[PDB]
Design a protein around this ligand. Structure first.
Ligand SMILES: CCCCCCCCO[C@@H]1O[C@H](CO)[C@@H](O)[C@H](O)[C@H]1O
Ligand SMILES: CCCCCCCCO[C@@H]1O[C@H](CO)[C@@H](O)[C@H](O)[C@H]1O
Length: 297
């Protein structure tokens, strides 16, 4: 089993699949000089965005395998976005302004992953291995128009208006660099196979770019968070239609826990910039449902 000294650059298997990606990311702003309370929060979300997913696995030795994976959206997907503010420092906890944007879309999203697997168990009917790898994912959104419910000077959720259809918009990009460790495995009875994979990271580095388009309030925000936590849980079920062709179905969840980081503001109008330590926060989570084929050459 895992105690067999040999080399097999010959052992390779490919994995191609289709499915959907659903998720949500929360963009937060904090005021250091005010207890570090939350003052802004943008909630970008979207469901069933079609994606193509694939992997190439090299089972070089009984002890270790190398793998490269990736997925990307197959076109855009309309979503939703909500922007709230807590301008009342005497009542932080209840939002004072809420802007809704149904006209939002996930322009695109993708991810690649390179890893190594150290097999603890490697038999014909069951596999258990440690993992170590690196992943990078990107997201890009755009919100347009929408309605609001702001708070006047001496009022509260009174200034209930509406935005110019298509005007004032916002662009939001993100990047997640994730070095990680994991556990993967699968048991096989007859031609049926059940498997799972778990990932963890405490070294995540996320960064985002928020574009506020409006020849009036045209600002650019940039944030970066470090040593952020990441968790992932995936499970699959499949059948060996042929000795070396597995048809399978899979479900994956993953989360990036919120943490504070630094942010930089760029006001194009006044050509003024502003830096604020621990002024930003970033978090997200995703659900990936997929089905496909794993061919072992
Ligand atoms: C097999 C891969 C097919 C990829 C094609 C995806 C087509 C959907 O893609 C979408 O089409 C819209 C209409 O033109 C555009 O406005 C969007 O920007 C684009 O993302
Ligand atoms: C078989 C594999 C098909 C892959 C289809 C890829 C279609 C490319 O998709 C494109 O990705 C860009 C990201 O840079 C987006 O900005 C574009 O709006 C999107 O259409």
């Amino acid at each position: 089993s895992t105690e067999t000294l040999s080399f097999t650059p010959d052992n390779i298997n490919a994995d191609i699949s289709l499915g959907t990606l659903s998720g949500k990311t929360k963009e937060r702003v904090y005021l250091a000089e005010e207890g570090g309370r939350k003052v802004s929060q943008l909630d970008w979300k979207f469901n069933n965005a079609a994606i193509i997913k694939g992997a190439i696995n090299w089972d070089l030795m009984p002890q270790i395998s190398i793998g490269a994976a990736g997925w990307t959206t197959l076109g855009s997907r309309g979503g939703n976005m909500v922007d709230q503010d807590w301008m009342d420092s005497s009542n932080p906890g209840t939002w004072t302004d809420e802007a809704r944007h149904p006209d939002t879309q996930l322009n695109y999203a993708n991810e690649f992953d390179l890893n190594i697997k150290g097999w603890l168990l490697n038999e014909p009917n069951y596999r258990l291995g440690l993992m170590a790898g690196y992943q990078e994912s990107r997201y890009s959104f755009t919100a347009r128009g929408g309605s609001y419910i702001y708070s006047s000077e001496e009022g509260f959720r009174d200034d209930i208006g509406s935005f110019p259809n298509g005007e004032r918009a916002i662009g939001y990009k993100q990047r997640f660099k994730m070095p990680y460790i994991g556990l993967t495995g699968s048991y096989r009875y007859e031609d049926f196979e059940l498997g799972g994979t778990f990932k963890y990271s405490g070294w995540v580095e996320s960064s985002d770019n928020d574009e506020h388009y409006d020849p009036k309030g045209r600002i650019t925000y940039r944030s970066k968070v470090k040593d952020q936590n990441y968790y992932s849980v995936a499970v699959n079920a499949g059948y060996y239609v042929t000795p070396n062709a597995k048809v399978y179905v899979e479900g994956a969840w993953n989360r990036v826990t919120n943490k504070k980081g630094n942010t930089s503001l760029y006001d194009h109008n006044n050509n003024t910039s502003d830096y604020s330590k621990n002024g930003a926060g970033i978090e997200n989570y995703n659900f990936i449902t997929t089905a496909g084929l794993k061919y072992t050459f």
